[PDB]
Design a protein around this ligand. Sequence first.
Ligand SMILES: C[S@@+](CC[C@H](N)C(=O)[O-])C[C@H]1O[C@@H](n2cnc3c(N)ncnc32)[C@H](O)[C@@H]1O
Ligand SMILES: C[S@@+](CC[C@H](N)C(=O)[O-])C[C@H]1O[C@@H](n2cnc3c(N)ncnc32)[C@H](O)[C@@H]1O
Lengths: 1024, 49, 49
Amino acid sequence: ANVWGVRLADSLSSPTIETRTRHYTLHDFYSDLDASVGKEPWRPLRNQRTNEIVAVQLFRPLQGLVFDTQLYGFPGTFSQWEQFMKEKLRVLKYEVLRIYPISTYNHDRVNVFVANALVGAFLSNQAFYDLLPLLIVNDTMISDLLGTGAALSQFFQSHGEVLEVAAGRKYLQMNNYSNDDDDPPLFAKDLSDYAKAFYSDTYEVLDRFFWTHDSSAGVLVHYDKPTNGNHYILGTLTQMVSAPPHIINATDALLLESCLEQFAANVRARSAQPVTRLDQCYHLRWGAQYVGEDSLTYRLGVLSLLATNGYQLARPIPKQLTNRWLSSFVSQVVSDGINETPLWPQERYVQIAYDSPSVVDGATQYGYVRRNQLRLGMRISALQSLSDTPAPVQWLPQYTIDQVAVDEGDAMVSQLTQLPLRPDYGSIWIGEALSYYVDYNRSHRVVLSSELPQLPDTYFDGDEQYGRSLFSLARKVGDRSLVKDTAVLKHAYQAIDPNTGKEYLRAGQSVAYFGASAGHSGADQPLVIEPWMQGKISGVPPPSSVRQFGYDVAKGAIVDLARPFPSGDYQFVYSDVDQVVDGHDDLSISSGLVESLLDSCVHATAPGGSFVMKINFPTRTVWHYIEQKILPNVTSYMLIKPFVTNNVEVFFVAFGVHQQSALTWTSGVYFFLVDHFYRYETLSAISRQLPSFGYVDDGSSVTGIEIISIENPGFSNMTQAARVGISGLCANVGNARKSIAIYESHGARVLTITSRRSPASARRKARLRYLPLIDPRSLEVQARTILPSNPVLFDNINGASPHVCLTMMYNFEVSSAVYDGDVVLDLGTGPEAKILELIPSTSPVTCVDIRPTAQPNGCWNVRTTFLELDYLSDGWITGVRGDIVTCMLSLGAAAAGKSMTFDAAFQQLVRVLTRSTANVLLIQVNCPTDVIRTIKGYLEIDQTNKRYKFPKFGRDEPYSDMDSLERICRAAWPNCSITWVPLSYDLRWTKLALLESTTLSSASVRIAELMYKYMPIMRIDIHG
Amino acid sequence: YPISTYNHDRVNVFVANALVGAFLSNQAFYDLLPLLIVNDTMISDLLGT
Amino acid sequence: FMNIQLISPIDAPILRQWAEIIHRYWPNPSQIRYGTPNVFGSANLFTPP
Ligand SMILES: C[S@@+](CC[C@H](N)C(=O)[O-])C[C@H]1O[C@@H](n2cnc3c(N)ncnc32)[C@H](O)[C@@H]1O
Ligand SMILES: C[S@@+](CC[C@H](N)C(=O)[O-])C[C@H]1O[C@@H](n2cnc3c(N)ncnc32)[C@H](O)[C@@H]1O
């Protein structure tokens, strides 16, 4: 790289072909003097935010507008303005055609100065008739104006072989121009006089003229292909004001405009389209004794020389210039910083380097010198700006061989974080409530009521209430009661009686409702009543009439449901009355209130019917009371569980009241209660480790989000410190998804990196010894403008896929199986090893898969070994030392890749594993455990050819049964202890999926379990 | 103030609020600008200024 | 006055400059020999004779 604002290194370009000039004849002057609708000598400029015409750029025939705006008196609107100009130029056209016959003056060149001054005098009514004899030129363009005798000092005057002429009005200001921040800058070329261009034929005569003439503001040359002959331009002392924070003067604005125009022209060079001029830069010639170093005129002379040599700006410029952009560019150029380029602005001549791509030396005889001394090390190419995105995009790292200490990267990321901020939280658990049910069977088991479990004693503590309130605040639903009622009715109308053969509950039922609440942001009733009455559930028949009781009715009556009350006898009754409102926060009064609700709901049941009771706090007294009283008077029952919010509440449904029978509790109910309570314990232990709902993050939380935001000026090889900081963030993140965003923030190009941490990430940070470093090339190439978004904690809003959920299940099985301080080996990790986040920190690993990995070699505390030699083959496992081998989601892939059967692939695997020294092992096998349901859209089997056909991945794998698998295992080892681990109904595997900040599902976790039952994981201990 | 060298230092709340209130009222806000970046605590700069 | 750094040049520039001029360019006291102590004696009490 940079001078004071960053220019684009590593490339430089310039246009090549220059158009041959064209003499301006009288027919061209007439065709420009009338205004065709296709082309006219003015182009309108327009505002950027309003699309309003606020300025007019002028061209060749009308460029002599040197007088004040009041002398002309143009109308302010653009349409009336251009109509006025067309009419008055048509009058001037008739005048000049009346003077000169076209048929005899068709093919002679006309005089440009007289043309511009004639238009400017006719628009100002300033005695233009003495210009008409000078319109046709002879013997050259300049000597007629020198040796003429017509006295007119408003436009030109001669000093003896040096003509001076007052140029003016490249641009024209309209009425609605108001110095707005999206107005186009006019570069002080709309005033009466911004410069006085002095024309001659030879630069020696010009330099002799500027001995006695002053050079206060400094003169400017052109040297490439000037407008009307070889000349200097001296700007006056007027100011430009349409750039807010600082005011520049005239020649500063001219040099700035031409430097920016050449910066525009250097990018758009395509080596086949021609340009009208190779460089438009000025290269100041005499005023350098007055404007010195660190001034803006000197710095723009430096940038003018760099533009002539052919450099490019590091950031792209707009097609239409704005005052904000111009202000930002000049505010970048007046700053601190040295000139890093070897190009220094000279005084005798404009210099160009040895390998600069400009070919201006060949098309110009005087001005340019190919300096063989200084060289430019950068290569030659054009600019390639990549197209920006509005959303942040994902980034993946690639590592290198170098390494540093961990605490250095920790200190650098502590310098670079913007971590004390408040992220948006998201949602833990999305979808419909999961349903867990069990029903009475006559032939299971009789158990006593004292053997069934109860609530844990540490239930009403602060951390437990914290976990339940966090899960209830983060879990997103519609209506809790609606989802619970749909679940309990769909699982209630499946029951059949042992007395008759149809079912218990039918249509036309005349039900009763207990515990009604009014407010549900809809009707003033629970939201299941009218769809269940209209039959919209379509798993139910509609009842005949629904009456609703409870403390908070709107279309019923308020009673106390504990002790009885005047009412009818209802054939069915659904009750929700809960033990929180009337119970005074103790289990004794809560259990007694449960007993009273059971008494009232039994006496209000109209015998030969059914009832549903909810129980918040199932305790031993409740189980003993219901086993002593309710079960002898009930034909059959079931107790189910809709799972929407993490609590221990269950539902009790009894069928066939007031018949004498003998019913007890069963071992299946015991298993259901153990599963229910252990599920609550695991999910509460997960929920007590998350941060709160609306927290700010400080870094001390074991899970959360962290960002850094370091800046990158243009194209530049980033330093050591940025690389250490980003690599330390990568070591802190541990191969989660990482998203970046590149955007200009407060006048600085800066990039952010947003990702999340986990306890598995902390385990991986405990694995390694030295901090490795990334390859920064994938970030150095990026030249986009990636607009950021506000950070969220749970990014996945659609939920997790069942393949991901199945992968987390197998990962939890591996992390539960692997003990501490044990040698392991894995078959088929991939380019990244997920097993590094699973095994403990002291346990060494040696993973093998054919594909080359991406995890770094070296810099670990314990032994890690990466090798790629097609593990299914033979002759490699002799030197390999391990205690347990793991093959996850890869044995079927290898069997499909070798196009061989699953039994033969498993036999080849066990033949190559007999040579190892391991004793325990667990691998994933493809085996049907239950009867096949051939899952629609996720796993559609082939019964004949025995393939799997995953439709989401487009792959299929062979399989065989556990009989054949056990046959080959017992043929391999006679003393092997084969076992099959069951699935987790208790959701114990959800630790890795929630602590790594992923919203799971409901339907996809159901599909993931029903997919796991068709491809389980077996464990082999070859001893015992 | 350049942002690239003054990115990660805490700013002074009193000077910030008084600077906004003085700029909205046109009441010679330039003598507050040296007090905007804080040092050694938030309150002692305003005491010993 | 005894410690310069308690005067900020933002708040009192020329007064800090005057403190600099005093602390740098105040005349240094020196000492010269006179008399004949060896046979005249000297009535110098605190200074060496
Ligand atoms: C059963 S729960 C919540 C029921 C849920 N709003 C519903 O619509 O299914 C608590 C509600 O039961 C009502 N209720 C009626 N009689 C009650 C009793 N004896 N004890 C506790 N709650 C009772 C209360 O008015 C309270 O709104
Ligand atoms: C990335 S894994 C899938 C299982 C992975 N452990 C997981 O949990 O996602 C699939 C890899 O297994 C490797 N693989 C499959 N069969 C193989 C064989 N016979 N020899 C070596 N590598 C094999 C492939 O290179 C492939 O990259």
